[PDB]
Amino acid sequence: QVLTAKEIKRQEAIFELSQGEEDLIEDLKLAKKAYHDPMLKLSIMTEQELNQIFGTLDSLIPLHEELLSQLRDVRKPDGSTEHVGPILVGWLPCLSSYDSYCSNQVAAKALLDHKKQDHRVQDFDLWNFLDIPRSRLVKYPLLLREILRHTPNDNPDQQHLEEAINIIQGIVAEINTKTGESECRYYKERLLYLEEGQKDSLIDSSRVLCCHGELKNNRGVKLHVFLFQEVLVITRAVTHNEQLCYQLYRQPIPVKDLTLEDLQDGEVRLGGSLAFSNNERVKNFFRVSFKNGSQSQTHSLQANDTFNKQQWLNCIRQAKE
């Protein structure tokens, strides 16, 4: 009857939902056209490696095209939409494919982190388009709730939207839990212990990888560091028997014995052959040390930027508790 501001907001929310599907489809097709196809023709990575990076994305595109097609089809001649509830509830089951996808994400990301070392590739965001699908999944509750809050009590979409939101919340929570477990298992199976006393039961018992990432030490060594809930593991990414592995650099440091010290920019002292500007070389460092008699250790580690350095400080402090 009366056109309300709320109804205009509801139409905005519905239109926005479909535009996001369109944007996702466009970006995933673009990933394949600008990155996959081009690298394949120029053999920038093996067919194996490329299949492992864009291979699954192609199974997700049809899911979103189907949702978009249905949302488009239901619009009235004037472009408005009466109900989106039935369509969402009927489409949701196809999200089961996100389980398979999110589970293989760790292997793809691990490979991708290694490839940014290859010059052939870097002589080209290839590094983050893989996060697009998961980001969309995580955002569905927010997007559907934006429609719900402007949906009137006499509109049946209220119940259907409440249902869709609840179901997706359940899907996301489960996929996030499994992803966390898969990540921790994936890296534990790839740790390589080539020297005495590097194994530790705390690594074996870990079920949570708080955070991990590349850090460069004050001697120019590129390390991949893993903060499991109770133990820090410092490694170098290497290839051992056809596979990307993480060779322990020192014995693991139990979090209960890890002393963390923030270093101000310029406080670090560098060694070895010499980021390129002197200021870039001495910024964003922190120190981790471990008292262990003859095997005591100390590491001055450099994060990727100011934000990444804080992330590391926050995670280590949180794990220590």
UniProtKB/Swiss-Prot annotation:
Any one of the GO CC terms: cytoplasm
Subunit note: Interacts with RHOA and RHOB.
GO terms for MF: guanyl-nucleotide exchange factor activity
Alphabetical keyword list: Cytoplasm, Guanine-nucleotide releasing factor, Phosphoprotein
Lineage of the organism: Eukaryota, Metazoa, Chordata, Craniata, Vertebrata
Free-text function comment from the UniProt entry: Acts as a guanine nucleotide exchange factor (GEF) for RhoA and RhoB GTPases.
Residues of the full protein shown: 113 to 448 of 524
Biological process annotations from GO: intracellular signal transduction
Occurrences of domain PH (ranges): 165-321
Domain DH stretches: 9-178
UniProt protein name: Rho guanine nucleotide exchange factor 3
Subcellular localization: Cytoplasm
